[PDB]
């Protein structure tokens, strides 16, 4: 928000306004990075981004501690070298390359289509990077008519997304990604669980309106009473939530689930790519911005 607005106070005392991305700006498949970039907490153009710039932006503007993004930083830079063909040092070339498929970006996302979702021909691909309202609605509708949801509900959401993606993706494309997805499950509990409930730290429940605002708008739901978690969330909370989602009892089983979908997931680890392997072409679509309605500087 505009610095003088005090909308962030006393949790964030140095805010900057929302500015929609223009056609030449680089955006990510990540709703967190996109929100940060839209506020200029990382470069508005989404290019040439250092580890410290990312650390500071998450910590000071989102209540996300350095521990939370340690692996994510490692993996961003692995993907940068893989896509560009050379070491990216400490300047992430852009946000867009993070949408390189079957890498950090993965299938059965909550709010993005898959790289080969519903393509008629094997060589074709689609926008697996920009926010997709229809896809996100498939996640939201698992919890239709509710204001909050728990770990068991999140397990049901990711299962619905896995089922839909396994059915709709070009045959042979679909690749299950429980470890990366469920760290992201943890990230959702970390950012938008309801801190106004007395047991939030131990038994977090996601506030659906906050989740929807964040993903749809790629900005922060201050108008709905949200603020950055204080103190900043740490990695332990995230991986615990990840475990809990995958351990939760499944009461409604979708068909067309991949083998081993139900049950615990592997620890997320650093990515690696064969030097021989050429990267998949990146979707070239202009960056998405909210248009129904468009956002003002304080939104
Ligand atoms: C340097 C730090 C980060 C990097 C490089 C990064 C990168 C990515 C990438 C490449 C994806 C796409 C995965 C996919 O859904 O196919 C993604 C998704 C996602 N990110 Fe991040 N991320 C970072 C930090 C965070 C943080 C701190 C949060 C929240 C606290 C967050 C929230 C999410 C969520 C919820 C998704 C899933 C979106 C969906 O499934 O529709 N990210 N991120
Ligand atoms: C995306 O953000 C816009 C702008 O903040 C939301 O529309 C506003 O919602 C606030 C409460 O958050 C209301 O006080 C205003 O009346 C709304 N303003 C406008 C211009 O409509 C919108 O609801 C957000 N979208 C989602 C899905 O959360
Ligand atoms: C983000 O960076 C990537 C990697 O450099 C860009 O993708 C490459 O763009 C060049 C043209 O400039 C092509 O020759 C390559 O084929 C692209 N690589 C892949 C794997 O697709 C991408 O255009 C950049 N995006 C933005 C918006 O800046
Ligand atoms: C991205 O751009 C490529 C060349 O610029 C196209 O060949 C791709 O199909 C893809 O096009 C999509 O996004 C661009 C924005 O760069 C639009 O101009 C296209 O109409 C399309 O939506
Ligand atoms: C914001 O400023 C107030 C008043 O000086 C201070 O009490 C508070 O600790 C500040 N918040 C942060 C996150 O530094
Ligand atoms: C989230 O984190 C837990 C604990 O490391 C994993 O079991 C899960 O697969 C996901 O990565
Ligand atoms: C989540 O899982 C990690 C290991 O993946 C633990 O280190 C952490 O304490 C939490 O249980
Ligand atoms: C790990 O931590 C999370 C968040 O505190 C809990 O919800 C979970 O039960 C486990 O203790
Ligand atoms: C979350 O909890 C599960 C079950 O204990 C672990 O296997 C995982 O490593 C993480 O600590
Ligand atoms: C069984 O219970 C789970 C959560 O406890 C729901 O998500 C599911 O829809 C079913 O009613
Ligand atoms: C749906 O069915 C699966 C097995 O097919 C169970 O694991 C789940 O608990 C639910 O009953
Ligand atoms: C219970 O919920 C699951 C997951 O959302 C559905 O796939 C199933 O049809 C049932 O309604
Ligand atoms: C499709 O298959 C699943 C089990 O794999 C069932 O739970 C569902 O009811 C449907 O028959
Ligand atoms: C990480 O691992 C891959 C194999 O999965 C290697 O190709 C790469 O060079 C690095 O050792
Ligand atoms: C990278 O490009 C090579 C050709 O150099 C393809 O064979 C490969 O599958 C990938 O798209
Ligand atoms: C986004 O842009 C629209 C024009 O389409 C304005 O009406 C709105 O206030 C927001 O700035
Ligand atoms: C973000 N993962
Ligand atoms: Br489709
Ligand atoms: Br797994
Ligand atoms: Mn994806």
Curated annotation (Swiss-Prot):
Sequence positions that bind heme: 30
Enzyme class, broadest EC rank: oxidoreductase
Free-text remark on how the cofactor is bound: Binds 1 heme b (iron(II)-protoporphyrin IX) group per subunit. Binds 1 Mn(2+) ion per subunit.
Active site: 184
Disulfide bond entries: 80-88
Cofactor list: heme b; Mn(2+)
Sample GO molecular function, one term: chloride peroxidase activity
Post-translational modification: N- and O-glycosylated.
The EC number(s) this enzyme carries: 1.11.1.10
Glycosylation (residues): 13, 94, 217, 239-240, 242-243, 249, 251-253, 276, 284, 294
Modified residues (Pyrrolidone carboxylic acid): 1
Entry keywords, A to Z: Chloride, Cleavage on pair of basic residues, Disulfide bond, Glycoprotein, Heme, Iron, Manganese, Metal-binding, Oxidoreductase, Peroxidase, Pyrrolidone carboxylic acid, Signal
Catalytic activities: RH + Cl(-) + H2O2 = RCl + 2 H2O
Known outcome of mutating residue 30 to H: Retains most of the chlorination, peroxidation, epoxidation, and catalase activities
Chain positions recorded as Mn(2+) binding sites: 105-106, 109
Function noted in UniProt: Catalyzes peroxidative halogenations involved in the biosynthesis of clardariomycin (2,2-dichloro-1,3-cyclo-pentenedione). The enzyme also has potent catalase activity and in the absence of halide ion, acts as a peroxidase similar to plant peroxidases.
Family: Belongs to the chloroperoxidase family.
Protein name, per record: Chloroperoxidase
Protein's gene: CPO
Residues represented out of the complete protein: 21 to 319 of 373
């Amino acid at each position: 928000q505009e610095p003088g607005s005090g909308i962030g106070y006393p949790y964030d005392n140095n805010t900057l306004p929302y500015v929609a991305p223009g056609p030449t700006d680089s955006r990510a498949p990540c709703p967190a990075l996109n929100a940060l970039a839209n506020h200029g907490y990382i470069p508005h153009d989404g290019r040439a981004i250092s580890r410290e710039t990312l650390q500071n932006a998450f910590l000071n503007h989102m209540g996300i501690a350095n521990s939370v993004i340690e692996l994510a930083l490692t993996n961003a830079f692995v993907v940068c070298e893989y896509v560009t063909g050379s070491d990216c040092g400490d300047s992430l070339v852009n946000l867009t390359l993070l949408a390189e498929p079957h890498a950090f970006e993965h299938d059965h996302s909550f709010s993005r289509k898959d790289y080969k979702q519903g393509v008629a021909n094997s060589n074709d691909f689609i926008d697996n990077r920009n926010f997709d309202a229809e896809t996100f609605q498939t996640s939201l509708d698992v919890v239709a008519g509710k204001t909050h949801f728990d770990y068991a509900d999140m397990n049901e959401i990711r299962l619905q997304r896995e089922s839909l993606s396994n059915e709709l993706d070009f045959p042979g494309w679909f690749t299950e990604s429980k470890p990366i997805q469920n760290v992201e499950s943890g990230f959702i509990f970390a950012l938008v669980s309801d801190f106004n409930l007395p047991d939030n730290d131990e038994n977090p429940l996601v506030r659906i309106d906050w989740w929807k605002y964040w993903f749809t708008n790629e900005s922060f739901p201050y108008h709905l009473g949200w603020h950055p978690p204080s103190p900043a969330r740490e990695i332990e909370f995230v991986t615990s939530a990840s475990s809990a989602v995958l351990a939760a009892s499944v009461t409604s089983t979708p068909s067309s689930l991949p083998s081993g979908a139900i049950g615990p997931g592997a620890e997320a680890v650093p990515l690696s790519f064969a030097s021989t392997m050429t990267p998949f072409l990146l979707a070239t679509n202009a960056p998405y911005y909210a248009q129904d309605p468009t956002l003002g500087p304080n939104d």
